[PDB]
Amino acid sequence: MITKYLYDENAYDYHDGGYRPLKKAPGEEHPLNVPAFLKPDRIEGNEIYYTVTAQAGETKILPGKPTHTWGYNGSILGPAIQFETGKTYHVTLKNELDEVTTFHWHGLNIVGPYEDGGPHAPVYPHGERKITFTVDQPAANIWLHPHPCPETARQVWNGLAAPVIITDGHEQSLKLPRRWGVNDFPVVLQDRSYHDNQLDYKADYDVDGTLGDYALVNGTVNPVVNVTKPIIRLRFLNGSNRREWRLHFADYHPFTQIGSDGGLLPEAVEMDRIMLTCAERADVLVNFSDYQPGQEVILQTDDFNLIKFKIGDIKKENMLLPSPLAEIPALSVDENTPVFKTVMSGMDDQVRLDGKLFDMQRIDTRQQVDQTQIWEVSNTNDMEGGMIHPFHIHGCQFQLIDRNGHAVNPNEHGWKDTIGVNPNETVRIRVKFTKLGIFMYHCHILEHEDTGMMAQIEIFD
Ligand SMILES: [Cu+2]
Ligand SMILES: [Cu+2]
Ligand SMILES: [Cu+2]
Ligand SMILES: [Cu+2]
C-alpha cells in the first residue's frame, strides 16, 4: 500500500513565495454537481453525431449574484461525453462566444493539427467546424478543453472544460460501479478566486501559474456526496491552471487506483494518498462499507476539507478486482530504437522547451509513424526552489521506462499522456504515434504554455 505522494516534496507548489492556500468558500454546502451525458443529435448505426457549442451563461456558485461563466452546451464546464472504441463520431464544433476558441480532445488519438483542436484549429465567433474520427484506444478518462494560442489559461479559467469517457468491451466486463451520479462520479478539480462574485483572470493572473482561493469541484463549492451504495468510483481530473492536488481522506482511509490518463492499469494499486499534477487523471474505487450509517468522511487536499461524504443506509460489500486488471501491450524497444531528448528549463517568464519559445510555423522534431520512439524528458530546474512541470504530448498515449534510471512510480505501469517531471529529473518514456500530422508537446501549467513552453512534432512516412 502506497503511503507517500510519489512526487519530490522539495519541489511542491506550497514552497513558492506568493503561494496562496485554499480557504473556506462562503455559504451553505451543496450536493456535488454531476453533469448529465451529452445526447447524440442522431445515430446512423455505428456512426454518432454530437454538437458541442462554446457559450457564455450564468452559474450560481457563491450565495448572492450568479457568476458570468463560459461552458460547453451550458453555463459552466460541459456535459459528460461518452465515446466507445470502434464507433465513428461526427462532431459539429460551434463558437457562440465573442472571441476565437479551439476544441482540443486531451488524450484522444486523432490526426493533427486540425482534427486534434490545437492552436492551428481556430473556430471564429458564430463559426462552425465539423470533424470525423474513429475511436481506437482503450477505455480511459479523457477531457475536452480550449487550446488557442495564447488564450488557453484564460478560457479554461472562465469555465471551458468537459469530462470525456471512452468505454470498451473489457472495462464493461469488470462490472464496476456504473450508476452515474450515485455510484460513479466525475471529479473535475479546479481553483478559482471571485471579486464581485465574478471571475477576473487579469486581476488574479500569475506568470508562474494562476492559483484560486476557493476549491471548484464540477463547478460547485462546498460539495457533498450522499453515499447510497458503499463501493464508489471517482474519476479524478486535475483541471486547475497550476495547483497540484494531494488527495487523501482525513482518517487516511485506503482506496484503490484502477486507471491512469490512457486507461485501466495492468494491476489495481491500493494507497491512502495520491498527488495529481495538472491534466493528470486518477480513476479510484473507495469502499465506505467500513463506516456506520450516520458518519461523515471528509476528502482533503493537504489539511484543507475538499468534499464531505455523508454515508447513508449503506449495506456491507467486499471490494474484489481481478489480477491482472487489464492487459497492456508492451512497446518493443531494441538497440537501434531512435532517442529524442527534450529539456524543460526556466520558471515564471524564463520558461523554455529546448531553450526556445513556441512558433506556429516551426517544426522542432520529426518522427516516423507506427515505429516506437524513446523520449528523455528533462526538468533542468534546481531541486532548491525548483518546480514540478506536468509534461504532455498530443495525439498519443505512452509508457514510462524509468525516472532518473531508477524504477517508475507504482501507478505508472500503464498508459499516460501527462507526467510530472521533478527538478533535476530525466524521465524515459516510449511512444508509438499511430496517426499522421502535426502534434504539440508542452508543460500543462496553462500560463507556462501561454508564455510559449510548447513545441511541434511532424509524424511522416
Ligand atoms: Cu490538455
Ligand atoms: Cu492535449
Ligand atoms: Cu512548466
Ligand atoms: Cu495541449
Short mmCIF file of C-alpha atoms and ligand atoms in Angstrom, two decimals:
data_model
loop_
_atom_site.label_atom_id
_atom_site.label_comp_id
_atom_site.label_asym_id
_atom_site.label_seq_id
_atom_site.Cartn_x
_atom_site.Cartn_y
_atom_site.Cartn_z
CA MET A 1 0.00 0.00 0.00
CA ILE A 2 1.42 3.43 -1.13
CA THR A 3 1.71 5.79 1.93
CA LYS A 4 3.62 8.61 0.07
CA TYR A 5 2.73 11.24 -2.62
CA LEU A 6 5.22 9.82 -5.26
CA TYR A 7 6.48 13.34 -6.27
CA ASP A 8 9.52 15.14 -4.70
CA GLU A 9 8.29 17.14 -1.62
CA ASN A 10 11.22 19.63 -2.17
CA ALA A 11 9.51 20.91 -5.41
CA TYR A 12 5.77 21.00 -4.32
CA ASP A 13 3.64 24.12 -5.10
CA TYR A 14 3.40 25.28 -1.39
CA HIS A 15 7.20 26.13 -1.28
CA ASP A 16 6.76 29.09 -3.74
CA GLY A 17 6.63 32.66 -2.35
CA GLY A 18 3.22 34.02 -3.48
CA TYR A 19 1.68 30.52 -2.99
CA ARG A 20 -1.91 31.12 -1.70
CA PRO A 21 -3.52 28.16 0.17
CA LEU A 22 -7.21 27.16 -0.33
CA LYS A 23 -9.71 28.73 2.13
CA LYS A 24 -13.38 28.01 3.02
CA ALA A 25 -15.90 29.28 0.40
CA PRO A 26 -18.86 31.13 1.99
CA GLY A 27 -22.49 29.92 2.23
CA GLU A 28 -24.27 26.54 2.67
CA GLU A 29 -22.72 23.22 1.49
CA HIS A 30 -24.07 21.96 -1.91
CA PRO A 31 -24.57 18.44 -3.35
CA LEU A 32 -21.76 17.66 -5.88
CA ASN A 33 -22.84 18.73 -9.43
CA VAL A 34 -22.78 15.66 -11.77
CA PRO A 35 -23.09 16.81 -15.42
CA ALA A 36 -25.69 14.79 -17.43
CA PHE A 37 -24.38 12.87 -20.52
CA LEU A 38 -24.37 14.63 -23.95
CA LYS A 39 -27.27 13.16 -26.05
CA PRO A 40 -26.46 12.15 -29.68
CA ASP A 41 -28.07 14.52 -32.28
CA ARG A 42 -28.52 11.38 -34.49
CA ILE A 43 -27.30 7.71 -34.56
CA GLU A 44 -26.97 6.04 -38.02
CA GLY A 45 -25.82 2.55 -36.82
CA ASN A 46 -22.12 2.65 -35.66
CA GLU A 47 -21.81 6.44 -36.53
CA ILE A 48 -22.69 9.04 -33.80
CA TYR A 49 -23.27 12.81 -34.40
CA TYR A 50 -22.61 15.23 -31.45
CA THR A 51 -22.98 19.05 -31.33
CA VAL A 52 -20.67 20.93 -28.87
CA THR A 53 -21.26 24.74 -28.51
CA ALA A 54 -18.89 27.06 -26.53
CA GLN A 55 -21.25 29.64 -24.91
CA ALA A 56 -21.49 32.24 -22.07
CA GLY A 57 -24.13 31.93 -19.29
CA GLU A 58 -24.73 32.47 -15.52
CA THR A 59 -23.91 29.91 -12.75
CA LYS A 60 -24.99 30.06 -9.06
CA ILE A 61 -21.70 29.12 -7.24
CA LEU A 62 -21.49 31.62 -4.31
CA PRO A 63 -24.60 32.85 -2.41
CA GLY A 64 -25.89 36.18 -3.88
CA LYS A 65 -25.23 37.18 -7.55
CA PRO A 66 -24.79 34.48 -10.24
CA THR A 67 -21.22 34.27 -11.73
CA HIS A 68 -20.84 35.02 -15.51
CA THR A 69 -19.23 31.73 -16.77
CA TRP A 70 -18.27 30.09 -20.12
CA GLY A 71 -19.34 26.47 -20.80
CA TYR A 72 -19.99 23.80 -23.46
CA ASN A 73 -23.79 23.24 -24.05
CA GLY A 74 -24.40 25.04 -20.67
CA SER A 75 -23.26 27.90 -18.34
CA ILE A 76 -20.00 26.29 -16.94
CA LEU A 77 -17.73 23.27 -17.75
CA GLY A 78 -19.65 20.86 -20.07
CA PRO A 79 -21.76 17.67 -20.17
CA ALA A 80 -20.16 14.19 -19.76
CA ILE A 81 -19.31 13.00 -23.35
CA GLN A 82 -19.34 9.19 -23.90
CA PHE A 83 -17.13 7.74 -26.70
CA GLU A 84 -16.98 3.96 -27.49
CA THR A 85 -13.93 2.22 -29.11
CA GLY A 86 -14.87 1.03 -32.66
CA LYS A 87 -17.60 3.73 -33.04
CA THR A 88 -17.11 6.63 -35.54
CA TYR A 89 -18.11 10.20 -34.45
CA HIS A 90 -19.12 13.33 -36.48
CA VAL A 91 -18.74 16.32 -34.06
CA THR A 92 -20.01 19.82 -35.01
CA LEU A 93 -17.96 22.43 -33.04
CA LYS A 94 -19.83 25.79 -32.62
CA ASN A 95 -18.31 29.01 -31.12
CA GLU A 96 -21.13 31.21 -29.66
CA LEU A 97 -18.55 33.43 -27.81
CA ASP A 98 -17.36 36.93 -28.95
CA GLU A 99 -13.71 35.73 -29.50
CA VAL A 100 -11.68 32.88 -31.15
CA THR A 101 -11.51 29.40 -29.49
CA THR A 102 -10.40 25.79 -30.22
CA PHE A 103 -11.72 22.27 -29.28
CA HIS A 104 -8.79 20.08 -28.04
CA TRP A 105 -9.57 16.43 -27.05
CA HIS A 106 -6.80 15.88 -24.41
CA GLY A 107 -5.78 12.16 -24.52
CA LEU A 108 -7.68 11.19 -27.75
CA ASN A 109 -5.58 9.57 -30.57
CA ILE A 110 -6.66 11.58 -33.70
CA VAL A 111 -4.98 13.33 -36.70
CA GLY A 112 -3.46 16.80 -36.04
CA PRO A 113 -3.28 19.68 -36.29
CA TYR A 114 -6.95 20.49 -37.32
CA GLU A 115 -8.91 17.39 -36.11
CA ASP A 116 -6.76 17.48 -32.89
CA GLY A 117 -8.02 21.01 -31.99
CA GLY A 118 -4.58 22.63 -31.42
CA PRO A 119 -3.93 26.39 -31.99
CA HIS A 120 -3.97 25.71 -35.83
CA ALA A 121 -7.72 24.77 -35.42
CA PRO A 122 -9.45 28.13 -34.73
CA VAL A 123 -13.29 28.44 -34.64
CA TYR A 124 -14.19 32.18 -35.06
CA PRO A 125 -17.22 33.80 -33.31
CA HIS A 126 -20.53 32.41 -34.78
CA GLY A 127 -18.29 29.85 -36.61
CA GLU A 128 -18.78 26.09 -37.27
CA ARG A 129 -16.13 23.28 -37.57
CA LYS A 130 -17.11 19.64 -38.46
CA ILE A 131 -14.65 16.81 -37.55
CA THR A 132 -14.78 12.99 -38.08
CA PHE A 133 -12.76 10.33 -36.16
CA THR A 134 -12.94 6.62 -35.20
CA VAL A 135 -12.09 5.93 -31.51
CA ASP A 136 -9.36 3.20 -31.47
CA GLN A 137 -7.82 3.18 -27.93
CA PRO A 138 -8.75 1.52 -24.58
CA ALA A 139 -11.43 2.78 -22.10
CA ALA A 140 -9.99 5.91 -20.35
CA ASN A 141 -10.97 9.16 -18.55
CA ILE A 142 -10.27 11.87 -21.20
CA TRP A 143 -11.20 15.62 -21.30
CA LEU A 144 -12.02 18.43 -23.78
CA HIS A 145 -10.67 21.99 -23.17
CA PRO A 146 -9.97 25.09 -25.33
CA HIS A 147 -6.41 25.30 -26.80
CA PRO A 148 -5.95 28.65 -28.68
CA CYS A 149 -2.52 30.47 -28.60
CA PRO A 150 -2.03 32.11 -26.11
CA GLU A 151 -5.58 32.43 -24.59
CA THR A 152 -5.81 28.81 -23.20
CA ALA A 153 -5.21 29.71 -19.48
CA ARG A 154 -7.92 32.47 -19.51
CA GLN A 155 -10.51 30.39 -21.48
CA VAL A 156 -10.11 27.40 -19.02
CA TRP A 157 -10.28 29.90 -16.06
CA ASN A 158 -13.65 31.24 -17.42
CA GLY A 159 -15.01 27.63 -17.21
CA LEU A 160 -14.36 25.81 -20.56
CA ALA A 161 -13.60 22.13 -19.70
CA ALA A 162 -15.68 18.90 -20.10
CA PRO A 163 -15.03 15.38 -18.72
CA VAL A 164 -14.96 12.79 -21.60
CA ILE A 165 -15.29 8.98 -21.12
CA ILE A 166 -14.05 6.30 -23.58
CA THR A 167 -15.58 2.83 -22.79
CA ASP A 168 -14.65 -0.61 -24.29
CA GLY A 169 -15.78 -4.28 -24.04
CA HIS A 170 -13.18 -5.16 -21.34
CA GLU A 171 -13.94 -2.21 -18.95
CA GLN A 172 -17.69 -3.17 -19.18
CA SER A 173 -16.73 -6.87 -18.43
CA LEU A 174 -15.32 -5.77 -14.99
CA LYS A 175 -18.87 -4.75 -13.78
CA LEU A 176 -17.59 -1.66 -11.84
CA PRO A 177 -19.84 0.93 -10.10
CA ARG A 178 -21.97 2.15 -13.09
CA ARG A 179 -24.91 4.26 -11.65
CA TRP A 180 -23.92 7.77 -12.95
CA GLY A 181 -24.35 10.29 -10.06
CA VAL A 182 -24.95 7.55 -7.37
CA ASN A 183 -22.04 5.02 -7.81
CA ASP A 184 -19.83 6.70 -10.46
CA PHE A 185 -18.62 10.36 -10.25
CA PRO A 186 -16.52 12.68 -12.43
CA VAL A 187 -14.35 14.79 -10.02
CA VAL A 188 -13.03 17.79 -12.05
CA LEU A 189 -10.65 19.58 -9.57
CA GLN A 190 -10.32 23.40 -10.11
CA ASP A 191 -9.39 26.50 -8.01
CA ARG A 192 -10.92 29.99 -8.68
CA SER A 193 -10.93 33.44 -6.96
CA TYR A 194 -14.07 35.70 -7.19
CA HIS A 195 -14.42 39.53 -6.92
CA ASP A 196 -17.98 40.99 -7.32
CA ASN A 197 -18.94 37.25 -7.11
CA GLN A 198 -17.23 37.22 -10.59
CA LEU A 199 -14.22 35.72 -12.48
CA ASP A 200 -11.43 38.23 -13.40
CA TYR A 201 -8.39 36.38 -14.90
CA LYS A 202 -6.42 39.68 -15.44
CA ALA A 203 -6.72 40.56 -11.68
CA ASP A 204 -5.64 37.03 -10.49
CA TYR A 205 -3.04 36.38 -13.30
CA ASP A 206 0.35 34.95 -12.17
CA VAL A 207 3.10 34.27 -14.82
CA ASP A 208 4.22 31.13 -12.86
CA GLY A 209 0.65 29.66 -12.94
CA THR A 210 -2.59 31.19 -11.52
CA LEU A 211 -3.99 29.98 -8.14
CA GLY A 212 -7.59 30.33 -6.83
CA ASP A 213 -8.72 30.85 -3.19
CA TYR A 214 -11.87 28.62 -3.38
CA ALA A 215 -11.94 24.92 -4.49
CA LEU A 216 -14.25 24.43 -7.56
CA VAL A 217 -15.27 20.71 -7.95
CA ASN A 218 -17.51 20.05 -11.03
CA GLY A 219 -18.27 23.84 -10.86
CA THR A 220 -19.75 23.53 -7.30
CA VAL A 221 -18.32 24.94 -4.00
CA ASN A 222 -18.53 23.16 -0.56
CA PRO A 223 -19.52 19.91 -2.37
CA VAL A 224 -21.32 16.97 -0.61
CA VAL A 225 -21.84 13.34 -1.87
CA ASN A 226 -24.53 11.11 -0.23
CA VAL A 227 -23.16 7.51 -0.27
CA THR A 228 -26.17 5.24 -1.12
CA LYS A 229 -24.04 2.21 -2.20
CA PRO A 230 -20.74 1.55 -0.36
CA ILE A 231 -18.34 0.96 -3.36
CA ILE A 232 -17.98 4.27 -5.32
CA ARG A 233 -15.90 5.14 -8.45
CA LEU A 234 -14.24 8.64 -8.50
CA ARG A 235 -12.80 9.80 -11.90
CA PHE A 236 -10.31 12.48 -10.64
CA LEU A 237 -9.01 15.09 -13.14
CA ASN A 238 -6.70 17.99 -12.10
CA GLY A 239 -8.36 20.71 -14.26
CA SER A 240 -6.52 23.54 -12.39
CA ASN A 241 -4.26 26.11 -14.19
CA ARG A 242 -1.28 25.27 -11.85
CA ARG A 243 -2.42 23.98 -8.39
CA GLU A 244 -1.32 20.38 -7.51
CA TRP A 245 -3.88 18.27 -5.52
CA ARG A 246 -2.60 15.99 -2.68
CA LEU A 247 -5.82 13.93 -2.16
CA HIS A 248 -6.48 11.76 0.96
CA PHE A 249 -9.34 11.03 3.43
CA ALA A 250 -8.99 12.79 6.85
CA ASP A 251 -8.56 9.33 8.56
CA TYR A 252 -6.31 8.08 5.64
CA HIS A 253 -8.98 5.52 4.58
CA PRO A 254 -7.35 3.27 1.91
CA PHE A 255 -8.61 3.43 -1.73
CA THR A 256 -7.71 1.51 -4.94
CA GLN A 257 -6.42 3.24 -8.12
CA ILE A 258 -7.66 1.31 -11.23
CA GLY A 259 -6.96 3.91 -14.00
CA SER A 260 -4.38 6.41 -15.34
CA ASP A 261 -4.62 9.06 -18.16
CA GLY A 262 -4.73 6.49 -21.02
CA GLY A 263 -6.80 3.64 -19.48
CA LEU A 264 -7.05 0.89 -16.80
CA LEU A 265 -3.76 -0.05 -15.02
CA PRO A 266 -2.37 -3.60 -15.54
CA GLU A 267 -2.84 -4.20 -11.75
CA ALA A 268 -5.01 -2.37 -9.14
CA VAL A 269 -2.89 -0.24 -6.70
CA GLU A 270 -4.04 0.21 -3.04
CA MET A 271 -2.97 3.55 -1.41
CA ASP A 272 -4.13 6.11 1.26
CA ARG A 273 -2.96 9.31 -0.60
CA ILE A 274 -2.35 10.49 -4.23
CA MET A 275 -0.85 13.66 -5.83
CA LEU A 276 -2.07 14.89 -9.29
CA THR A 277 -0.06 17.48 -11.33
CA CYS A 278 -2.06 19.49 -13.98
CA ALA A 279 -4.09 17.40 -16.53
CA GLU A 280 -3.29 14.06 -14.75
CA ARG A 281 -6.34 11.76 -14.20
CA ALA A 282 -6.67 9.07 -11.45
CA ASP A 283 -9.55 6.51 -11.57
CA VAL A 284 -10.04 5.15 -7.98
CA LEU A 285 -12.55 2.95 -6.07
CA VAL A 286 -13.42 3.67 -2.37
CA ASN A 287 -15.20 1.11 -0.07
CA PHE A 288 -17.34 3.04 2.53
CA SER A 289 -18.76 -0.37 3.75
CA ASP A 290 -16.21 0.22 6.61
CA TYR A 291 -18.14 3.22 8.17
CA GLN A 292 -21.55 3.29 10.00
CA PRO A 293 -24.78 4.82 8.54
CA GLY A 294 -24.69 8.21 10.42
CA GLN A 295 -20.97 9.14 9.94
CA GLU A 296 -19.21 11.85 7.81
CA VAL A 297 -15.87 11.14 5.99
CA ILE A 298 -14.07 14.25 4.56
CA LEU A 299 -11.78 14.04 1.48
CA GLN A 300 -8.93 16.60 1.84
CA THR A 301 -6.12 18.13 -0.27
CA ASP A 302 -3.28 18.64 2.29
CA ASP A 303 -5.02 19.93 5.52
CA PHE A 304 -7.98 21.51 3.55
CA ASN A 305 -11.52 19.90 3.57
CA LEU A 306 -12.46 19.45 -0.14
CA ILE A 307 -15.60 17.18 -0.30
CA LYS A 308 -17.73 15.63 2.50
CA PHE A 309 -19.03 12.01 2.06
CA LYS A 310 -22.27 11.65 4.10
CA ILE A 311 -22.65 7.83 4.47
CA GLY A 312 -26.38 6.82 4.42
CA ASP A 313 -28.13 3.42 4.91
CA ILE A 314 -25.12 1.51 3.42
CA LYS A 315 -25.07 -2.34 3.07
CA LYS A 316 -21.75 -4.25 3.66
CA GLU A 317 -19.90 -5.20 0.41
CA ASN A 318 -16.31 -6.58 -0.06
CA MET A 319 -14.45 -4.84 -2.97
CA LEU A 320 -12.71 -7.51 -5.18
CA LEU A 321 -10.99 -6.82 -8.57
CA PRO A 322 -9.22 -9.29 -10.90
CA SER A 323 -5.40 -9.72 -11.19
CA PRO A 324 -4.42 -8.84 -13.79
CA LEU A 325 -6.86 -5.84 -14.00
CA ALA A 326 -6.08 -5.23 -17.74
CA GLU A 327 -3.55 -6.46 -20.38
CA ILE A 328 -1.30 -3.55 -21.57
CA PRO A 329 0.66 -4.34 -24.78
CA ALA A 330 4.42 -3.63 -24.25
CA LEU A 331 6.02 -1.35 -26.92
CA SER A 332 9.15 -3.18 -28.27
CA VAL A 333 12.39 -1.15 -27.60
CA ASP A 334 15.57 -2.58 -29.31
CA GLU A 335 19.16 -1.14 -29.56
CA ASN A 336 18.52 0.77 -32.88
CA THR A 337 15.34 2.47 -31.41
CA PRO A 338 15.79 6.25 -32.01
CA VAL A 339 16.08 8.54 -28.90
CA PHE A 340 14.82 12.19 -28.68
CA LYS A 341 16.00 14.44 -25.77
CA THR A 342 13.72 17.41 -24.74
CA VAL A 343 14.76 19.77 -21.87
CA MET A 344 12.23 21.74 -19.77
CA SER A 345 14.11 24.72 -18.18
CA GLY A 346 13.33 28.07 -16.51
CA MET A 347 10.43 29.31 -14.32
CA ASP A 348 7.90 32.24 -14.44
CA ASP A 349 8.61 34.23 -17.70
CA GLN A 350 12.02 32.46 -18.35
CA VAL A 351 10.33 29.05 -19.08
CA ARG A 352 11.66 27.28 -22.27
CA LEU A 353 11.45 23.95 -24.22
CA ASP A 354 14.98 23.08 -25.58
CA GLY A 355 15.77 26.81 -24.92
CA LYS A 356 13.07 28.07 -27.39
CA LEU A 357 9.60 29.73 -27.25
CA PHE A 358 6.67 28.37 -29.34
CA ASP A 359 6.35 29.37 -33.06
CA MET A 360 3.27 28.07 -35.00
CA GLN A 361 5.31 27.73 -38.29
CA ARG A 362 8.44 26.00 -36.75
CA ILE A 363 8.65 22.13 -36.55
CA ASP A 364 11.01 21.29 -33.60
CA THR A 365 11.16 17.46 -34.24
CA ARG A 366 10.16 14.86 -36.91
CA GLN A 367 9.42 11.16 -36.05
CA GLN A 368 8.14 8.12 -38.08
CA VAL A 369 4.57 6.62 -37.78
CA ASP A 370 3.90 3.14 -36.21
CA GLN A 371 7.62 2.92 -35.14
CA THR A 372 8.12 3.13 -31.31
CA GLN A 373 10.37 6.03 -30.09
CA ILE A 374 12.24 6.70 -26.77
CA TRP A 375 11.97 10.20 -25.16
CA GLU A 376 14.34 11.62 -22.48
CA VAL A 377 12.20 14.45 -20.91
CA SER A 378 14.42 16.53 -18.52
CA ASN A 379 13.42 19.17 -15.91
CA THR A 380 16.59 21.34 -15.55
CA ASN A 381 15.21 23.44 -12.57
CA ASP A 382 17.21 23.43 -9.26
CA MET A 383 15.99 20.89 -6.59
CA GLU A 384 16.39 24.02 -4.38
CA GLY A 385 13.27 26.21 -5.12
CA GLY A 386 12.51 24.17 -8.29
CA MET A 387 9.12 23.31 -9.86
CA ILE A 388 7.30 20.08 -10.98
CA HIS A 389 6.30 20.68 -14.67
CA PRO A 390 3.45 18.43 -15.94
CA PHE A 391 4.78 17.37 -19.42
CA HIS A 392 2.05 16.40 -22.00
CA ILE A 393 2.10 15.10 -25.65
CA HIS A 394 -0.89 15.37 -28.10
CA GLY A 395 -2.36 12.59 -30.29
CA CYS A 396 -0.90 9.61 -28.33
CA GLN A 397 -0.57 7.57 -25.10
CA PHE A 398 2.95 6.49 -23.92
CA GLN A 399 4.53 4.12 -21.34
CA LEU A 400 7.29 5.02 -18.80
CA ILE A 401 10.68 3.17 -18.75
CA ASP A 402 12.44 4.90 -15.77
CA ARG A 403 12.69 8.06 -13.59
CA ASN A 404 16.44 9.04 -13.34
CA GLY A 405 17.40 5.43 -14.32
CA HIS A 406 15.51 4.09 -11.21
CA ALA A 407 12.15 2.20 -11.02
CA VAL A 408 8.91 4.00 -12.12
CA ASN A 409 6.17 5.03 -9.57
CA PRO A 410 3.68 2.21 -8.72
CA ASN A 411 0.77 3.94 -10.61
CA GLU A 412 2.73 4.41 -13.93
CA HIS A 413 2.99 0.79 -15.34
CA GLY A 414 0.05 1.66 -17.70
CA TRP A 415 -0.89 4.32 -20.32
CA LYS A 416 -0.18 8.06 -19.61
CA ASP A 417 -0.31 11.34 -21.66
CA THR A 418 0.94 13.84 -18.96
CA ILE A 419 3.72 13.19 -16.35
CA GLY A 420 5.08 15.46 -13.58
CA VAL A 421 8.88 15.92 -14.10
CA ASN A 422 10.69 16.76 -10.79
CA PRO A 423 13.63 19.23 -10.75
CA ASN A 424 16.98 17.58 -11.81
CA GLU A 425 14.92 14.57 -13.12
CA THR A 426 15.10 12.93 -16.60
CA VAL A 427 12.08 10.60 -17.33
CA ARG A 428 12.43 7.86 -20.01
CA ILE A 429 9.19 7.13 -21.98
CA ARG A 430 8.47 5.08 -25.17
CA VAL A 431 5.71 6.20 -27.61
CA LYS A 432 4.37 4.80 -30.93
CA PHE A 433 2.43 7.53 -32.85
CA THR A 434 -0.43 5.87 -34.87
CA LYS A 435 -1.89 8.93 -36.77
CA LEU A 436 -0.06 11.26 -39.27
CA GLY A 437 0.07 15.09 -38.89
CA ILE A 438 1.47 17.94 -36.70
CA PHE A 439 1.16 17.35 -32.89
CA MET A 440 2.18 19.57 -29.93
CA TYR A 441 4.04 18.75 -26.67
CA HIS A 442 4.32 21.19 -23.71
CA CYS A 443 4.07 21.83 -19.94
CA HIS A 444 0.38 21.62 -18.81
CA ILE A 445 0.72 24.61 -16.43
CA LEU A 446 -1.52 26.80 -18.68
CA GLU A 447 0.44 30.09 -18.03
CA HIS A 448 3.82 28.40 -18.96
CA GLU A 449 2.07 27.02 -22.11
CA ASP A 450 0.62 30.54 -22.93
CA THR A 451 4.15 32.07 -22.43
CA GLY A 452 5.39 29.59 -25.11
CA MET A 453 6.70 26.44 -23.29
CA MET A 454 5.45 24.38 -26.30
CA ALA A 455 6.89 22.67 -29.45
CA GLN A 456 5.67 20.71 -32.54
CA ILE A 457 6.40 17.19 -33.92
CA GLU A 458 5.62 16.22 -37.53
CA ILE A 459 4.83 12.47 -37.99
CA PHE A 460 5.63 11.17 -41.53
CA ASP A 461 6.14 8.02 -43.72
CU CU B 1 -4.84 19.30 -22.08
CU CU B 2 -3.60 17.57 -25.05
CU CU B 3 6.16 24.37 -16.74
CU CU B 4 -2.15 20.87 -25.45
#
